């Protein structure tokens, strides 16, 4: 059977403003099958209370999922999304950039 | 709403 690697976007719901409340988003899409592990990170530590949308899939049957938690950005806090999937040989690193 | 009640087995 077929398997598809996950596509990953790390981004904030609203424009990043230091000290202003926002939501950190990790949009995982284009992957197959559904079993996948997605973690949000702050300076390399697992963020708790991360939630996710209900599972759904695209026209080509590949799934898409949004993992999100509320946060407050600062000048030095570093963020990333950690995703493991059977199609991945190891965890795939996608660093959060304010202008991407 | 969802399907007209009954579903046909594959």
């Amino acid at each position: 059977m077929i398997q598809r690697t996950p596509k990953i976007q790390v981004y904030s719901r609203h424009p990043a403003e230091n000290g202003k409340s926002n939501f950190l988003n990790c949009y995982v899409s284009g992957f197959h099958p559904s079993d996948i592990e997605v973690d949000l990170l702050k300076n390399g530590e697992r963020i708790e209370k991360v939630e996710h949308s209900d599972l759904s899939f695209s026209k080509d049957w590949s799934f898409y999922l949004l993992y999100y938690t509320e946060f407050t950005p600062t000048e030095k806090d570093e963020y990333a999304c950690r995703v493991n999937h059977v199609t991945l040989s190891q965890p795939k690193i996608v660093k959060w950039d304010r202008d991407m | 709403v969802v399907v007209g009640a009954r579903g046909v087995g594959k």
């Binding site: 976007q9 899409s29 949308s53 209900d54 759904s56 899939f57 799934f63 | 046909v8 087995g9 594959k10």
Partner: protein, 275 residues
């Protein structure tokens, strides 16, 4: 405008770990409004939109029962297809079902849909005539004749031409406050040099709904594809969507490039230039 109701079903067998995971989501346009998860403790269809929350208990009792029926149908079919494909009972497998109906601005029926997949591949599909099927392999021919013999298309067309569009009219009416919106994209442009001789332009469009949108980068008015980068349309998480398109330009040549943003909520297309 035109609207669509779409349901997306996913049942994944998990051998040695219990019954398959069953996931159902209900959409109107790009607005989810009902869900079911076989692993959630509620064992109910749960509201995910404000205008669906007013639905009476009889609704939720019926929708939970019928979606449970679709959960048992999926579990049976997983083994039936395992026999059709002669696969080990130890492996995890996936069945994906999508169906729904479309209406025009007058609320009159336009199209009906039904597509079933196995392990992420097309299995059987209801044809446009809502009277015949299309098989992808010899296994689907087994189901095709079964459904031809069992007259499955008679039941689907009745719902798709009836209860599907009838309730799509009700959801769009009771949810007219949110579903008839056209949120135009809020756009801007960013510039990052890569080296002394090249730079990156990234055209943005945020907060737009629905998600259908077109971002076009042109050089001297001619559409550019090389040295472009287009990412998936992504939801912001509040009921709006985000997208961006990039292009690498030589330093000093940013002025020759234009980004063209087309959207349903925009009266006229926008043209963004690096100012």
């Amino acid at each position: 405008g035109s609207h669509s109701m779409r349901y997306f079903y996913t049942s994944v067998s998990r051998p040695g770990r219990g019954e398959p995971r069953f996931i159902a989501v209900g959409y109107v346009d790009d607005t989810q409004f009902v869900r079911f998860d076989s692993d959630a403790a509620s064992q109910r269809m749960e509201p995910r939109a404000p205008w669906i929350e007013q639905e009476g208990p009889e609704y939720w009792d019926q929708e939970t029962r019928n979606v449970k029926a679709q959960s048992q149908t999926d579990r049976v079919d997983l083994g039936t297809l395992r026999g059709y494909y002669n696969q080990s009972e130890d492996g995890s497998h996936t069945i994906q079902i999508m169906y729904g109906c479309d209406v025009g601005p007058d609320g009159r029926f336009l199209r009906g849909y039904r597509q079933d997949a196995y392990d992420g591949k097309d299995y059987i599909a209801l044809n446009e005539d809502l009277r015949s099927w299309t098989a992808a392999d010899m296994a689907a021919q087994i189901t095709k004749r079964k459904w031809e013999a069992a007259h499955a298309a008679e039941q689907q067309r009745a719902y798709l031409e009836g209860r599907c569009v009838e309730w799509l009219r009700r959801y769009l009416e009771n949810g007219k406050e949110t579903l008839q919106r056209t949120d135009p994209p809020k756009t801007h442009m960013t510039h990052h040099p890569i080296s002394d001789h090249e730079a990156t332009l990234r055209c943005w469009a945020l907060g737009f709904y629905p998600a259908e949108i077109t971002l076009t980068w042109q050089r001297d008015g001619e559409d550019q594809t090389q040295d472009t980068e287009l990412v998936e349309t992504r939801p912001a998480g509040d009921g709006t969507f985000q997208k961006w398109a990039a292009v690498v330009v030589p330093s000093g040549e940013e002025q020759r490039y234009t980004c063209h943003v087309q959207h349903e909520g925009l009266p006229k297309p926008l043209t963004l230039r690096w100012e």
